[PDB]
Amino acid sequence: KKVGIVDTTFARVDMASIAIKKLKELSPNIKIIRKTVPGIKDLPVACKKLLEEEGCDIVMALGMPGKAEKDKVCAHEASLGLMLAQLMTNKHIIEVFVHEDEAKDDKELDWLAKRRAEEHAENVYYLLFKPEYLTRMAGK
Amino acid sequence: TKKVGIVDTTFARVDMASIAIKKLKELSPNIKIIRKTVPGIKDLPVACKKLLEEEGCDIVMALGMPGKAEKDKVCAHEASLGLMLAQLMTNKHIIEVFVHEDEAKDDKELDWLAKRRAEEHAENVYYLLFKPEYLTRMAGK
Amino acid sequence: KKVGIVDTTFARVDMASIAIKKLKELSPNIKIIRKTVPGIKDLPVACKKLLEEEGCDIVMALGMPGKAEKDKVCAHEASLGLMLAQLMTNKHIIEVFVHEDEAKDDKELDWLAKRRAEEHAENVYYLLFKPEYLTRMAGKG
Amino acid sequence: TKKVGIVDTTFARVDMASIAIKKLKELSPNIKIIRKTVPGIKDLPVACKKLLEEEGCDIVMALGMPGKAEKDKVCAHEASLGLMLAQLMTNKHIIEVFVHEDEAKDDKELDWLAKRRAEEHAENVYYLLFKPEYLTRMAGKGLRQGFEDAGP
Amino acid sequence: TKKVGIVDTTFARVDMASIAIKKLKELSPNIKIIRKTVPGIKDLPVACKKLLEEEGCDIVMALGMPGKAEKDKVCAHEASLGLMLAQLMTNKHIIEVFVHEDEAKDDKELDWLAKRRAEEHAENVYYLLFKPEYLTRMAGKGLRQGFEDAGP
């Protein structure tokens, strides 16, 4: 299977490398394609292109919204864009958004975004290969 | 015959899917049921559309229990919009079953409320499938 | 000509009956089709299905949104759905949303819902038959 | 040749259409002009799109006058999205001529403002249709429709 | 790739297009450029889409400057979704270059900020067109357009 991973230069933490590593751990021969875009608002088309043009069965969308009110609106815009990209291709995009807000300092933020990217990576795996497991875990 | 798709999450703290399936099978024992579980509420829109367009579901139920934070309301509002888009792209209903965290006073109430709501929306799904004119009798009022 | 009328069970006034009465008043041989959905979020697809599958020329979406901030967010999602539904099918849907916000007490609420269903039903008649009366009334006078 | 759709409302407190039409016809005596009136702002988008796709309109003016209330502002935002989606689904412009009641003090000013906004937007229509490169001369020039230009 | 569209407005108070154009030609001298100017920020989405679909642009820069009021804030949000929707309908990037007036403390800063953000985004286009593996090198780093890089 093919997974697309779309990250940004805006993000203050590399989430991609740990997503990749988690995916390869769980399914050694799984195919990965990486695309990097400037900002969170560039994520929806890049994800869609990857789903429609590069054969990706699923995509992970990696972003890190800033602290401001304007950044919360940006992320909301991008969130909706991802939802539309998904409805246009009957394919999943797991939105991996870690707000800077969510950590108390840089060291915590680095750890948090990477742990979130790993966890969503696990989910991508389960959605691809073990979608009976997610049912077993239905709500706690 | 009729097919209902049921999409829920791992994140939610009540299993509403079981509540609704059971309700559905008692009112009409020959309804077909396909289930799909997604990590979170924002993954509900595609999964519902997929079940509608690819698995021949006549209708879908989308189940989730949003959190209480101001950022949970946005995610839920995000998801609800996807659900509405998914429906207009397929001329098929999706019944949204979102039970927010603040809608009950504690955990014990939240579990009971979510149970009640999942059952009630399953009733509505039944009416929409088999007696549409029974919703009209209680229209408005 | 054919009008679709979509209401809810959740609503607290029968607006549908009032719209239908006015409509058959102004045009005795207008064909009417009704569909009742549980809630406001279920309105847009019902409206779109009527427009596209039932040969409705125009549709009236009728609902009675609550007072809560949650009810307002829901109503807003509903209105966007109705707006997208109209663009995908080059057909009008006339929104008759009456928020509990707009009246004091139920007495006035009941009356205002009724009056709105009527005046909008008239607008529907005009769009269908006398679109040049609306032009006369553009910018109020 | 060259056709303009003008869509307005009965809800509006001021007639903006007559200004826009008069401006268009003085800018281009031969332009074809199509009018349609709807009850309200939420009715604008489908009316606009129908005008573009069914009546062969090259461009449309959507004229709207939202009320003062926060509920009105929500609907205005809903119409605005609608207008924007209509344009995308039919690669044609719709010029949003929305005048809020918040924008003026008194009715005399509301009357003045809405009419001047409609007129300046009518000229922009002339420009998109016949002389788009003029708008390029005016890139970054702080131009305002209604109230006076901000400037660079 | 060969073709870039640049869409700006008359509303904006700083000419953002010239600096982006200059950057583009500096990095890739033979690059094709096409410009359209619209009145406002809400007119950006369709102009952008037509350039992608009817003028054969590989990518577009959408340049605008939202005003200060909580109503220009809504206009830009509306305009941003439009931009995203235009991108998803085509499978083509539109780089949004919005400089809100609230971000600068006077006009001198705003001229500076808008020009810088435009230039850096123009550099981002270059990479997206020609060197997209470099953006992967800068994945998760401090990168900002206009204001100084935040750092990892």
User: CB–CB of D86 and C87 under 8 A?
Assistant: yes
The residue behind tokens 């573009």 is D52
- Rounded Cα–Cα distance for residues A48 and C43 (Å): 29
Tell me how close the Cα of A31 comes to any Cα of chain E, in angstroms. 18
Q: How was this structure determined?
A: X-ray
Q: How many CB atoms lie within 10 A of CB B22?
A: 12
- Terminal C-alpha separation, chain B: 32
Distance CA A14, CA A113 (A): 8
Nearest Cα neighbor of D2 from D151, D116, D127 is D127
Residues D85 and D95: their CA atoms lie apart, in Å, by: 13
Task: For residues B84 and B81, give the distance between their C-alpha atoms in angstroms, rounded to a whole number.
Answer: 5
Query: How far, in Å, CA of A34 to CA of E139, rounded?
Result: 10
Which residues make Cβ contacts (< 8 Å) with residue D9, sequence separation at least 6?
A: C138, C139, D37, D38, D39, D40, D41, D43, D44, D63, D64, D65
Query: CB-based contacts of D114: which residues, under 8 Å, 6+ apart?
Result: D12, D14, D16, D65, D99, D146
Angstrom distance (rounded) from CA A129 to CA B8: 18
Cβ-in-10-Å burial (0-12, 13-18, 19+) of D137 comes to: exposed
Question: And the tokens for B88?
Answer: 């207009």
Give me the residue label for tokens 């679109």: C131
Residue C83 has which token pair?
A: 């707006």
Chain D residues near residue C72 by CB distance under 8 angstroms: 74
- Check if the beta carbon of residue D12 is closer than 8 Å to that of residue C136: no
CB–CB of A138 and B13 under 8 A? no
Instruction: Show the DSSP H helices in E1-152 as ranges.
Output: 17-27, 44-54, 72-89, 107-130, 132-137
Chain B residues within 8 A of A120 when measuring between CB atoms: 39
User: Which domain, by its residues, includes C134?
Assistant: 1-141
The helix or strand, by DSSP H or E, that contains position B63, with its residue range, turns out to be strand B59-64
Q: Tell me the resolution in Å.
A: 2.3
The CATH number for A131's domain is: 3.40.50.960
Distance CA E31, CA E129 (A): 10
CA distance C108 to C114: 10
Tokens 């009416």 -> residue: B127
Q: What is the C-alpha separation between D64 and D9, in angstroms, rounded?
A: 7
Total Cβ atoms within 10 A of residue D136: 15
From the list E8, E75, E79, the residue facing D139 with the nearest CB is: E8
Own/partner long-range contacts of B103-110 (Cβ < 8 Å, ≥24 apart): B107/B13, B110/B13, B110/B14, B110/B65
Q: Distance (Å, rounded) from C-alpha D129 to C-alpha B4?
A: 51
Tally the domains of chain B: 1
Cα C81 to chain centroid, rounded:
13
Please report, as a single letter, which amino acid is at residue E116: R
Give the E-state strand segments of A13-92 in sequence order. 31-37, 58-63
Q: What phi, psi does C89 have (nearest 5°)? A: -130, 115
CA pair distance B35, B25, nearest whole angstrom: 14
Best of B84, B85, B96, B102 to disrupt the C interface (most C CBs within 10 Å) is B84
